Each structure stands twice: as C-alpha cells, then as structure tokens.
Amino acid sequence: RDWVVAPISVPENGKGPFPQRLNQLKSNKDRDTKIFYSITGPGADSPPEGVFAVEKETGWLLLNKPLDREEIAKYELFGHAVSENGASVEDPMNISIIVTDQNDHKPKFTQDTFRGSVLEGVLPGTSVMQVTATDEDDAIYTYNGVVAYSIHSQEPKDPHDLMFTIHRSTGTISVISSGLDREKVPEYTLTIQATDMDGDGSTTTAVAVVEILD
Ligand SMILES: [Ca+2]
Ligand SMILES: [Ca+2]
Ligand SMILES: [Ca+2]
Ligand SMILES: [Ca+2]
What we know:
Layout: E1 8-11, E2 20-24, E3 35-40, E4 52-54, E5 60-63, E6 74-83, E7 93-100, E8 108-109, E9 113-119, E10 126-130, E11 133-134, E12 148-155, E13 164-166, E14 172-175, E15 187-195, E16 203-213
Parallel strand pairs: 1-7, 9-16
Antiparallel strand pairs: 2-5, 3-6, 4-5, 6-7, 8-11, 10-14, 12-15, 13-14, 15-16
Bound molecules: calcium ion (CA) (4 copies).
C-alpha cells in the first residue's frame, strides 16, 4: 500500500554516501494535488536534530550522517503529507528505525588492578581470583562483545614463568605449577588481556596482583 513504511534497519558507521535514501513515503492523494512531505521526532526536528530528513517533493526519507548504536539504538519519527492548499491528507505515519551493531568498542576491564591471594601450599588447579572485562558491542547475535581472556606476562619468572593460567571465557586465574614459595617470591604481577571477537578482535590490558600468603 501507500502511506505505510516497514521498520528500517541501519548498520551504524555507514560510509554512505550521505545523505542516504532509506525509504520513500507516498500518499495516493498526489494524483489529485501536489503533496509536501515532512518528518518530525527525536532525530528529525528535535534533538538530535537533523540526523534524518525527508525530501519535500519526492517523499524520500534520508539519513544525513553515520549512526552510533551505543549513543541511540532506535528512533521513532513521524511522517506527514500536506497538500498545496495546506490540509494534511494523511494521519502522521509511524517510522521505526533500528540501529544494528558493528564492533567498534574495545573491551574494558572493570578495574585497572585486581588482587587475589593463595596459601603457599595450594595444589595445581587452584583458582586464585576472577577478573572481568566488559564490552559495549552486541554479544548476543555476534562476537562483537564476546571477550576471550589470556595472560600477557608474569613477573617475576621465579621459580619459572607461566605458573598461572586464565579461563578463556570466565576470567578465572588458576595456578598450574608447583613451587610457590613466599620466602623467595612473595608476590606475582600478571598483566592480563581481554580480546573481543572471542580472541580475534582488539585487546585491552589490566594487572592482576597475586599475593602468596603467610
Ligand atoms: Ca558505535
Ligand atoms: Ca567489541
Ligand atoms: Ca558497536
Ligand atoms: Ca585482530
């Protein structure tokens, strides 16, 4: 029919070119007279003003610039159709616009520094602590916001290096070697990493400080 518009999905960070046609509004009343189209709503005539617009004569709905999903993920605008003699010829039309995700956010550890402690005599397999990173991108239908964890490096490297691991998805740091000795090394500092696209994407760091208890 005319004067209907299906919900519209727009991936954020479009390259365009801009302005960009999305949909065309039309009233059947335009055989019988000249019609002027307009658009109102948050994103059109109210903040953020002028992201969307509509061509007066043609009814083309237009996007004027790239969208950001994490700023605004959905718009509801309203289309109007007014004849040349000034009478509206349609009831204002609901235009729904959905902003879909691209992976444009690095993960963030919730703290710059995490602390955990174990007794000197714990067995290999012992959970020390659980660190967490978040990611603002979609983690439901994509891996854009799915974080894989890894250990970047360990200091010091006595009695040897790679004495801990991290659970790839939970962030649980565990001890995988024997040989802890508070007297020799009372404390380890682990730089830890969080990578989105489940390990294929971009990566941030944090520190996890492990104390060997007395
Ligand atoms: Ca964004
Ligand atoms: Ca991400
Ligand atoms: Ca995103
Ligand atoms: Ca990568």
